[PDB]
Amino acid sequence: RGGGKTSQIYSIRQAIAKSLVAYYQKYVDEAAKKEVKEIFARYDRTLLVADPRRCEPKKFGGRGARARFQKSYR
Amino acid sequence: MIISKKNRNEICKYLFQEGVLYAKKDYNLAKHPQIDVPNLQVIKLMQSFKSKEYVRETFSWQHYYWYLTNDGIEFLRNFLN
Amino acid sequence: GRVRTKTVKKTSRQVIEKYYSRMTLDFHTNKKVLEEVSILQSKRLRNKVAGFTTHLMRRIQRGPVRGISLK
Amino acid sequence: VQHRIRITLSSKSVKNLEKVCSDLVKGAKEKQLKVKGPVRMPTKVLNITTRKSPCGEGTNTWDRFEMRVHKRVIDLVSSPDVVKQITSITIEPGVEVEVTISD
Amino acid sequence: QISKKKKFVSDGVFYAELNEMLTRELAEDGYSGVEVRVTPMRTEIIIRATRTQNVLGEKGRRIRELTSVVQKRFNFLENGVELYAEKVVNRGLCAIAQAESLRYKLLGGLAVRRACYGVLRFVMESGAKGCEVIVSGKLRAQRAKSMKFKDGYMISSGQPVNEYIDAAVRHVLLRQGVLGIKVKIMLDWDPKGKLGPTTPLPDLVTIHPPKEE
Amino acid sequence: TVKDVNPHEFVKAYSAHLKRSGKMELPEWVDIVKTARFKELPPSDADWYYIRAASMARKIYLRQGIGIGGFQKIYGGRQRNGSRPPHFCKSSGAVSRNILQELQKMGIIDVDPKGGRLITSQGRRDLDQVAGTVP
Amino acid sequence: SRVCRVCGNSHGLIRKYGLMCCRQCFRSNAKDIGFIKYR
RNA sequence: UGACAGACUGAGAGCUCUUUCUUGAUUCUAUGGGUGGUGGUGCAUGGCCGUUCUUAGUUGGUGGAGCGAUUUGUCUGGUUAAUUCCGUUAACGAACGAGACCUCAGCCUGCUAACUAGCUAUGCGGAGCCAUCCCUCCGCAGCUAGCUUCUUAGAGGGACUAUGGCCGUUUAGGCCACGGAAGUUUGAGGCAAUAACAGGUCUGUCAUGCCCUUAGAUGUUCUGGGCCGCACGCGCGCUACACUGAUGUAUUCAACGAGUAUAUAGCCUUGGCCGACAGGCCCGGGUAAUCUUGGGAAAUUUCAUCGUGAUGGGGAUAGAUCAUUGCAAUUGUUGGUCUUCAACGAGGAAUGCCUAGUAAGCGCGAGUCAUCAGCUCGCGUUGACUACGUCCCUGCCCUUUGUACACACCG
Numbered sequence A: 001r002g003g004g005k006t007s008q009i010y011s012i013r014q015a016i017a018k019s020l021v022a023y024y025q026k027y028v029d030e031a032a033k034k035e036v037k038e039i040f041a042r043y044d045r046t047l048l049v050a051d052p053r054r055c056e057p058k059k060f061g062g063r064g065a066r067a068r069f070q071k072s073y074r
Numbered sequence B: 001m002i003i004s005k006k007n008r009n010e011i012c013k014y015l016f017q018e019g020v021l022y023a024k025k026d027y028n029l030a031k032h033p034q035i036d037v038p039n040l041q042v043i044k045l046m047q048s049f050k051s052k053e054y055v056r057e058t059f060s061w062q063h064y065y066w067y068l069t070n071d072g073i074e075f076l077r078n079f080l081n
Numbered sequence C: 001g002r003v004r005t006k007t008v009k010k011t012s013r014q015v016i017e018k019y020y021s022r023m024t025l026d027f028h029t030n031k032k033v034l035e036e037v038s039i040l041q042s043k044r045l046r047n048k049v050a051g052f053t054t055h056l057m058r059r060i061q062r063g064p065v066r067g068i069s070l071k
Numbered sequence D: 001v002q003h004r005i006r007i008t009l010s011s012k013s014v015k016n017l018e019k020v021c022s023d024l025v026k027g028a029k030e031k032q033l034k035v036k037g038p039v040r041m042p043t044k045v046l047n048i049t050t051r052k053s054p055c056g057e058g059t060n061t062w063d064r065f066e067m068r069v070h071k072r073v074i075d076l077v078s079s080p081d082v083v084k085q086i087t088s089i090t091i092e093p094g095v096e097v098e099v100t101i102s103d
Numbered sequence E: 001q002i003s004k005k006k007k008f009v010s011d012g013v014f015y016a017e018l019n020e021m022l023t024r025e026l027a028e029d030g031y032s033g034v035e036v037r038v039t040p041m042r043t044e045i046i047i048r049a050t051r052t053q054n055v056l057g058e059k060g061r062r063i064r065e066l067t068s069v070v071q072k073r074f075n076f077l078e079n080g081v082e083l084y085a086e087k088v089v090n091r092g093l094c095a096i097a098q099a100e101s102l103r104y105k106l107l108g109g110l111a112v113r114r115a116c117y118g119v120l121r122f123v124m125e126s127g128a129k130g131c132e133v134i135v136s137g138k139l140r141a142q143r144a145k146s147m148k149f150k151d152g153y154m155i156s157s158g159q160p161v162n163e164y165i166d167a168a169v170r171h172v173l174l175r176q177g178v179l180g181i182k183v184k185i186m187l188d189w190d191p192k193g194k195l196g197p198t199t200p201l202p203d204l205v206t207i208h209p210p211k212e213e
Numbered sequence F: 001t002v003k004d005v006n007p008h009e010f011v012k013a014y015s016a017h018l019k020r021s022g023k024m025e026l027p028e029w030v031d032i033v034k035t036a037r038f039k040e041l042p043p044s045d046a047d048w049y050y051i052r053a054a055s056m057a058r059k060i061y062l063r064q065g066i067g068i069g070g071f072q073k074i075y076g077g078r079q080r081n082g083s084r085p086p087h088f089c090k091s092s093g094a095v096s097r098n099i100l101q102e103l104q105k106m107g108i109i110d111v112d113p114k115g116g117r118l119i120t121s122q123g124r125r126d127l128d129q130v131a132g133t134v135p
Numbered sequence G: 001s002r003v004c005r006v007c008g009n010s011h012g013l014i015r016k017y018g019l020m021c022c023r024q025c026f027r028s029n030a031k032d033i034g035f036i037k038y039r
Numbered sequence H: 001u002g003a004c005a006g007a008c009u010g011a012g013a014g015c016u017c018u019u020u021c022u023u024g025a026u027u028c029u030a031u032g033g034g035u036g037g038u039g040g041u042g043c044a045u046g047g048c049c050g051u052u053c054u055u056a057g058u059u060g061g062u063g064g065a066g067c068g069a070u071u072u073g074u075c076u077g078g079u080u081a082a083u084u085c086c087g088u089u090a091a092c093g094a095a096c097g098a099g100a101c102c103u104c105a106g107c108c109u110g111c112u113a114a115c116u117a118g119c120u121a122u123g124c125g126g127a128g129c130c131a132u133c134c135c136u137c138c139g140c141a142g143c144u145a146g147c148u149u150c151u152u153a154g155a156g157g158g159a160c161u162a163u164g165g166c167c168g169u170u171u172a173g174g175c176c177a178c179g180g181a182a183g184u185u186u187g188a189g190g191c192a193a194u195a196a197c198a199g200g201u202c203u204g205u206c207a208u209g210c211c212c213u214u215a216g217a218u219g220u221u222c223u224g225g226g227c228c229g230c231a232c233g234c235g236c237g238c239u240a241c242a243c244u245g246a247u248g249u250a251u252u253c254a255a256c257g258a259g260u261a262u263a264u265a266g267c268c269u270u271g272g273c274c275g276a277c278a279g280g281c282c283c284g285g286g287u288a289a290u291c292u293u294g295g296g297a298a299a300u301u302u303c304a305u306c307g308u309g310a311u312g313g314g315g316a317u318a319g320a321u322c323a324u325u326g327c328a329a330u331u332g333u334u335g336g337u338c339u340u341c342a343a344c345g346a347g348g349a350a351u352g353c354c355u356a357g358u359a360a361g362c363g364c365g366a367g368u369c370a371u372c373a374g375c376u377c378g379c380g381u382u383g384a385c386u387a388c389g390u391c392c393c394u395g396c397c398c399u400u401u402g403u404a405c406a407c408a409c410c411g
């Protein structure tokens, strides 16, 4: 729910990865889930750790959160 | 100005009872809240009573609050009582 | 860009003056030590001063130290 | 005899508001009512953005003003006179309460 | 019936209207603020000022006048609202009170220096951690100038400004110009909250003494 | 079923299905309209009145209580105002109206009390069968 | 036909929430209305 | 004092006139004085705001030096985003600014709860089916939770360079590595010092001094026009110059917010119907996590159509006509429909903005608003190249030095 398109897909990725790890940890074995932990994290860390990036807000004096308006002297 | 004695009487009967009166700068209403008058007499007869300082006045940003004085109660008692 | 200001360092030295045997090396233990022995107005300043006092420990415990005086 | 009542309760300040929330919950639970709450309902953020200059000179500078209006709702199962037995305790400044009789 | 956003905005505006309007009436009494409290079947407005028998008048006639005019202007239910005019607990820390006090000392013709330090010494003897008075305008000369007078502690940036800085601005209607007054008072930490604000300024540490056993 | 079938091929299969599975009435303005104000040409396909209906079939399938305006909005798009900045523009009313009326006339969908359009059970049967008959 | 409640002028109004005050009067009285400026 | 009729004038302004009726001490006349002014003066000013100046800077008390303006403290050096700190020290001890502070965002399977939030299970229903049950997906309800992970919002917790290595007087710190959600104070803002400007604002203000005006008015109201005029020059922008595209189907994903008694349903408008559209009719819902909207946004994705052509790029211009807002649409308010199909081949000299969910692309909401959003402020969606530097250009801060400058090199 929510997001865009690629955001939702990467959220799928994270959700299924963490769901498999949590299911294994609580219902299989901690050493068993540790292999899943290492397979996932060796390829990438972003499967398991949320990404703290957000569209940071837009400030006055420009259209854009970091740019400004084109500036004229004469 | 033009005023009817009945207009000025419904002013005096109202002021004797209340002692305060508020106008509004919203002009051309023909019906002040709580009395019946075209809002020109409300502003300007109490302007006259301020000129005679029977009523002392605080302007309050086009809200025109007036509260009558013990001199003006004598003025109106000299009329109706 | 992490240099501690005087409100930090003065307080760290002053608290380490008085409370030595009652506070230790571990950062989190010093946090909770400082909770009962001082009143501050921000958890981040609390963490800041506790984290300065902890390496004040790690320097005192091995050699002598400047003005701060302990019986 | 035992009916269902709503109390809705809003404010501007969280620290003021939560004191009232704990107030009514304990007022009910001293007398063992069937309560559920205090449901916390998403904060309204009133906002007005204004050019802080009064004449329109100098670099364009805006300032963003905002109120935060906080909404709380609690359900009680008691008679309205039993409710008035509770809701005569002191009410903190600024908070508003709007008890209503529901289905 | 109205929405809550609108109700809260309207009550803010109503508060603004009283707090502004009462300035012409209670100027020569040290008006300092009003607080509007919501009470059952009744409406309460605590004006706070410096003279009860002058705000009340004689046998509470003037507060009758004002409560009636507020009644009638803001169309309350009759006997709904009435106003008590209670005394400020302390008068030397109310920036508004000082603003109109200096306004009267300065309309009276009192010299600028004597008046301004009359404000400063009074504020300090009233136990204020710090104060400044800024006067701007055409005093005794044509080209405008600012006389700034300071004393004691003072904070000006960050959040605790709203917490501690009691600041007012007023105009003076002396001939050949207008003379503006700014009065800033820094408050002291009274955790009881009766006089000074409860929460302390966030540049303070109080290491407690080591009680011994 | 239809949630298992690729969302495009189900539309194709059902578009052929409501061609060969009997027939109905059809307005005599279908080969004129643009189906939306921001469009520029009428649909390049001939049986667009049928692919449209196949799509709007599964809309009421997988969502309930949809009005005509909901379809106007769902079938709007980007309107290029010329030199103005482009915007979002809702689609046409009559085209969706006659799709819904046609499907109602076959009883696939029907107007619900409390408002909206909901599928019927035998329409559900039909959509599930045609979904199952796709690779 | 519409002005400030405060100054009664015809520009710079803030119609939103029904204030009926201009951008200047609004700031001048903003803090007592309650528009705490957290950011 | 108001007015019938007729002339006058748009005027259904009795303003004036022919006409005699009505009100009655309210007036009218004259002298003063005020009142009102988006009139002048921002070079008389208050306030507010901007800027100097986003940098780290500033001022006392006592003491030292100097006849004195003044200087020291406020620094040799190291370090830091920082007058940040270590330390040095005729200074000592302090006051602001920095930091600290507050707001938003990011972490919490930890706590408080939530039929105006949502899972989860079962109970039936509907449809697919080794159909008889099961299994998959939807619908509805509850004394279903020994439900709060998703949603909300409170209290809290969390980061401290804490841990390790190396450099550094092994001080201040820096660079690196594990861990961790977070190791440019974690990201972005709010607030923000002394001194100043003849910076802007007398057109925000019953804020204002002085002048001018004050009835035949620069006062107030109305009508019509004007602010939009166009040989032209400049500034911020929008649309493009296409194939990484346009067109036409199919596919489906947010966030920020918004919604006066608005009268006889009325601001957001769901739903049914008519219409190609535009937009109309009827039932209604919502003062709101309740109805709008669980925002069904676009870009993008997919399948075809156009195939290098000023073409189906482009939508400038102009004609015909239709409906809504409005008491009024003309110098077309706006929105449709058909047609008209311009320049524009990636833009000279020059110049601007930008270092991570950032630039850029894409849409939404709000402000204005009866209608008009190419603008401004917010919001999310997709999402990078480059660098992690230097004082070369433009500027800033400190120290030293030079000065015939002080309105200060525009000397």
Ligand SMILES: [Mg+2]
Pocket: none
């Ligand atoms: Mg100024």
Ligand SMILES: [Mg+2]
Pocket: none
């Ligand atoms: Mg000396």
Ligand SMILES: [Mg+2]
Pocket: none
């Ligand atoms: Mg000497």
Ligand SMILES: [Mg+2]
Pocket: none
């Ligand atoms: Mg000295």
Ligand SMILES: [Mg+2]
Pocket: none
């Ligand atoms: Mg910061």
Ligand SMILES: [Mg+2]
Pocket: H042, H198
């Ligand atoms: Mg100036």
Ligand SMILES: [Mg+2]
Pocket: none
């Ligand atoms: Mg006119």
Ligand SMILES: [Mg+2]
Pocket: none
């Ligand atoms: Mg113009």
Ligand SMILES: [Mg+2]
Pocket: A069, H236
């Ligand atoms: Mg611009």
Ligand SMILES: [Mg+2]
Pocket: none
């Ligand atoms: Mg085209």
Ligand SMILES: [Mg+2]
Pocket: H373
């Ligand atoms: Mg708009």
Ligand SMILES: [Mg+2]
Pocket: H375
């Ligand atoms: Mg504009």
Ligand SMILES: [Mg+2]
Pocket: none
């Ligand atoms: Mg440049």
Ligand SMILES: [Mg+2]
Pocket: none
């Ligand atoms: Mg010279």
Ligand SMILES: [Mg+2]
Pocket: H409
């Ligand atoms: Mg030269």
Ligand SMILES: [Zn+2]
Pocket: G004, G006, G007, G008, G009, G021, G022, G023, G024, G025, G026, H204
């Ligand atoms: Zn205003």
